[PDB]
Design a binder for this molecule. Structure first.
Ligand SMILES: [Cu+2]
Ligand SMILES: [Cu+2]
Ligand SMILES: [Cu+2]
Ligand SMILES: [Cu+2]
Lengths: 72, 276
């Protein structure tokens, strides 16, 4: 089973996650994310840095972006 | 055909490497390397087909990718070769690597923008075109997201691992390849990406020219491991789903196998590499 969905405002931005095998959005723009064998996650803007969950990867992407719109 | 420690380059060698990189950028060729790497990193998965990362072919794939880039550099200036960055030694922001005459320094703290060196956005010579967000300037935060580069002792512990790779041949594996890549253990290659920050922490990490120097040293460490373990070789050696076996060819080239890339001396030597 995939992780649960989530939806929150983090540092002023809307981050959403949902099983699809899992999708993350930052202000409605899809963020590429991937699950590692051990259960951790990364995103395309943090692709060498495992974090425990997809919400953690979304939050890490908001931290990385420093307010920048994500590109599809 | 000799790859040198970046710390040892002469002023003239630094000038020529910078100029060749910037000409590949100007002509459009550089950005396609960025794009190839991002496509593989977004597709290489632990549970499916994996070729450039999180798999045994991580090492020969980056070897051939670096050879492609070096060949392209040499088409602009045949004297240029890829230098390597020994991050176990040159581990501070003060390393001449990060001088304005070479790669430029860390980014400012407001937006991570690199403000000096030949690749600073203000030069007009380094637009970030292949990207995951709107920002079009080179960014770094040296030592921002992780405090320390690997140390020589940590490197030696990885080099002491005798098996090249082990099932399941992915980010959960024991063995040299995955400890070198960094997904298990004290973490060598992945942690350097995280330490530089900016685009080097992302799928489009070749946007920072230090990508090449990092991977040239990772590639050197593979060579050093081979010298310490003459009795160990690439695995798997046949019939493994989703993974490139020794004699299978690798995408995107389709015409070369890990077997064709184990011996770097066919293509280049290092300034220094000890004998077993
Ligand atoms: Cu990915
Ligand atoms: Cu890579
Ligand atoms: Cu890398
Ligand atoms: Cu011996």
């Amino acid at each position: 089973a995939a992780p649960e969905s989530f939806d929150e405002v983090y540092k002023g931005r809307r981050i959403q996650g949902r099983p699809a095998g899992y999708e993350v959005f930052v202000d409605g723009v899809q963020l590429h994310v991937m699950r590692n064998a051990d259960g951790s996650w990364i995103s395309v803007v943090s692709h060498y840095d495992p974090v425990p969950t997809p919400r953690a990867a979304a939050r890490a992407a908001v931290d990385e972006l420093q307010g920048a719109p994500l590109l599809p | 055909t000799v790859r040198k420690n970046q710390a040892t380059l002469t002023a003239d060698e630094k000038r020529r490497f910078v100029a060749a990189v910037l000409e590949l950028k100007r002509s459009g060729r550089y950005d396609e390397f960025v794009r190839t790497h991002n496509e593989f990193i977004m597709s290489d998965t632990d549970s499916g087909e994996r070729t450039g990362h999180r798999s045994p072919s991580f090492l020969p794939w980056h070897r051939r990718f670096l050879l492609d880039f070096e060949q392209a550099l040499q088409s602009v200036d045949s004297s240029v070769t890829l230098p390597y960055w020994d991050w176990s030694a040159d581990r501070t922001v003060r390393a001449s690597l990060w001088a304005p005459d070479f790669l430029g320094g860390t980014g400012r703290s407001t937006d991570g923008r690199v403000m000096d060196g030949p690749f600073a956005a203000s030069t007009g010579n380094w637009p970030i075109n292949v990207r995951v967000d709107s920002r079009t300037y080179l960014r770094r935060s040296l030592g921002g997201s992780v405090a320390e580069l690997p140390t020589r002792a940590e490197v030696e512990s990885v080099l002491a691992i005798s098996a090249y790779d082990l099932p399941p041949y992915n980010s959960a594996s024991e063995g040299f390849r995955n400890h070198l890549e960094g997904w298990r253990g004290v973490n060598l290659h992945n942690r350097v990406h995280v330490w530089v920050g900016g685009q080097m922490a992302t799928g489009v990490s070749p946007n920072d020219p230090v990508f090449w120097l990092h991977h040239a040293y990772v590639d050197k460490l593979w060579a050093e491991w081979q010298r310490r373990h003459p009795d160990s070789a690439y695995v798997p050696t046949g019939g493994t789903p989703d993974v490139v076996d020794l004699n299978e060819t690798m995408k995107p080239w389709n015409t070369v196998r890990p077997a064709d890339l184990l011996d770097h001396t066919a293509y280049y030597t290092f300034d220094a590499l000890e004998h077993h």
